[PDB]
Every structure is written in C-alpha cells, then in structure tokens.
Write a protein that binds this ligand. Structure first.
Ligand code: XY3
Length: 284
C-alpha cells in the first residue's frame, strides 16, 4: 500500500519475547506472544551480530515457499534490521524425540505412532513434490502440537546440539546414524537420502525414542551397512512397517521408495489401524 511494503515483514514490537526454548540445544529460539492475535509463537533470532546472516535469510526465503499442514508454517519475519526474527506458531509439546521419551504409552498407542508416521510422510511427500531436500530429518527435528499433530521442522542442529548425535565428518558435523551411505561416502544428498533418514525416524518412533544402532560405535556404522547389516525390527513394530523401513534402507538410492509411495502405504495402514481401534474401544 506504500513503497516499502513487504507482506512477510512484521514489526518486532508486535511480539513479546519470553524464555529461550530447549536449553540452548535448539539454538536461539524463544517462546513469544504475538500480542494483537493472542497467539503464542516461537521465534528464532540471529541477534545482530554479523556472520550467520546469509543462512538466516536463506531459511526465511525457503520458509516463505512452504505451506503444508504437517510442515512448520511461517507467520512473519523481521529481516530489515537486526535483531532478525523468524516467527512460527508455538507447538505445545515440543520436539518429537523428547515427546516419545516422556509420553504416556496408553495415550500414545500404536495407532498414534502410525498417525505420526503418516503425518511425517505427508510432509515429506510435499517436499519431494516441490523438489526440496530436508537434509536432517529425525525425531529431534519434528514438533508435536495438540491432538498428536506432527509438523516436520529443521533447527539447523548440527552446530548446536552437544553430545554424539552430531560428529565431525567431511569437515562439517553429520548425524552419522541418520545419514544415507552415499551421503557419508560421496557427500551426495537428495530426496532419497531423506527417504533413508525417514526409515531411521520410523525406528525412533517404533522404539519411543531409542537412540539408533544401540551400542554400535559410530565408526563401524558405514562398514556394517556395506555388509547389508540393518537395525532389527523393534519389539511390537508391525511387520509391514518394518518392511517399509527396510525399503528406505536399500543401499542404492534409486531402489528406495518415493515419499509418495511411502505416504500412500502409511495412510492405508493408519486407516486399517484406526478401524480396528474404534472396534476394540467400542467394547465398553
Ligand atoms: C521459531 C522457528 C523458526 C524456524 C523453524 C524451522 O523449522 N525452520 C525450517 C527451515 C527450513 C526448512 C526446509 N529446509 C530444510 C533445509 N534444507 C537444506 C537444504 O537441503 C532445505 C529445506 C524447514 C522444513 F523442514 F520444515 F521445511 C523448517 C522452526 C521454529 C520453531 C519452533 C518451535 C515451535 N514450537 C516450539 C517449542 N515448543 O519449543 N519451537 C521450538
């Protein structure tokens, strides 16, 4: 309506900033409130101060293109002057890994685990359709809201998480146990390497958040996969889910299913499971 208008830019002072979320392990992300709309939000900030600026602007540019119920949805940014903000709606229960690790398993039952897998595969089919590559798909990068809503996110954690999730590899930091063989060896990433990660993410969901490849040194992971060793089916994981899991972990990326195929398979399984569940609960 005026020369300097940008439909994504918000006024920083519209937001009340509160506490840092995730103890620093998720970088500079704060809880906030968009006062005018009575909406609790999460806010990522750069905070002045030279040097990370390009990747912050790239993240904002990417998020302006992503609109899907199971992917985080940009509400606004402040990128005219520092501190920069990227703002999305707050998701009540935080990241999926800690959610699985702290949940009430009578509440988060097999049918809910399938619902969450289904939602994640929906988000990935959307990204695949748009030709985007996630590059770090894992439970720690998924978010949980009310009624077991899941949204895929990305917190650029390689630089931020401490401990052994990420370790030095090809000069950067890789989550070795989520990383496709072609990505570890040849540094090639694609939607098929995301598919491989999705398989590991399915194993996280099935085990309620166990760390992958239990008791195996990160240094032996590539050699094992090369011999065709794969993680075993976790207790209680249905056979059909383990089969999809195994397809995601085919050595040759072109041999992995597409997210369109995966999502179709989950929707089927979830609908099957939902029926069987309404029936069994309808006893009493
Ligand atoms: C404030 C905030 C800002 C940004 C994001 C965010 O997820 N950014 C993002 C950036 C890029 C991409 C896609 N690319 C990945 C890299 N790729 C590299 C290139 O291969 C390109 C494709 C995606 C994706 F994956 F979802 F689409 C998300 C999350 C939050 C949050 C939050 C929040 C909500 N509730 C809570 C809570 N309770 O504590 N918190 C913490």
């Amino acid at each position: 309506g005026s020369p300097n208008y940008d439909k994504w830019e918000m006024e920083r002072t519209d937001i009340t900033m509160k506490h840092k979320l995730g103890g620093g392990q998720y970088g500079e992300v704060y809880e906030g409130v968009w006062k005018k709309y009575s909406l609790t939000v999460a806010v990522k900030t750069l905070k002045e101060d030279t040097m990370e600026v390009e990747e912050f602007l790239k993240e904002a540019a990417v998020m302006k293109e992503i609109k899907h119920p199971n992917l985080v949805q940009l509400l606004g940014v402040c990128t005219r002057e520092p501190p920069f903000y990227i703002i999305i709606e707050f998701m009540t229960y935080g990241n999926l890994l800690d959610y699985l690790r702290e949940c009430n398993r009578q509440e988060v039952s097999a049918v809910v685990l399938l619902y969450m897998a289904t939602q994640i595969s929906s988000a990935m089919e959307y990204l695949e359709k748009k030709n985007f590559i996630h590059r770090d798909l894992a439970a720690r990068n998924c978010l949980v809201g009310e009624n077991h809503l899941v949204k895929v996110a990305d917190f650029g954690l390689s630089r931020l998480m401490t401990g052994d999730t990420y370790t030095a590899h090809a000069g950067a930091k890789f989550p070795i146990k989520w990383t496709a063989p072609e990505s570890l060896a040849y540094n090639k990433f694609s939607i098929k390497s995301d598919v491989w990660a999705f398989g590991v993410l399915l194993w996280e969901i099935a085990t309620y958040g166990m760390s992958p490849y239990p008791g195996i040194d990160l240094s032996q992971v590539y050699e094992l996969l090369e011999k065709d060793y794969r993680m075993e089916r976790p207790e209680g994981c249905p056979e059909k889910v383990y089969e999809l899991m195994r397809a995601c972990w085919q050595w040759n990326p072109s041999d992995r299913p597409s997210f369109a195929e995966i999502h179709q398979a989950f929707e089927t399984m979830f609908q099957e499971s939902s029926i069987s569940d309404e029936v069994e609960k309808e006893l009493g």
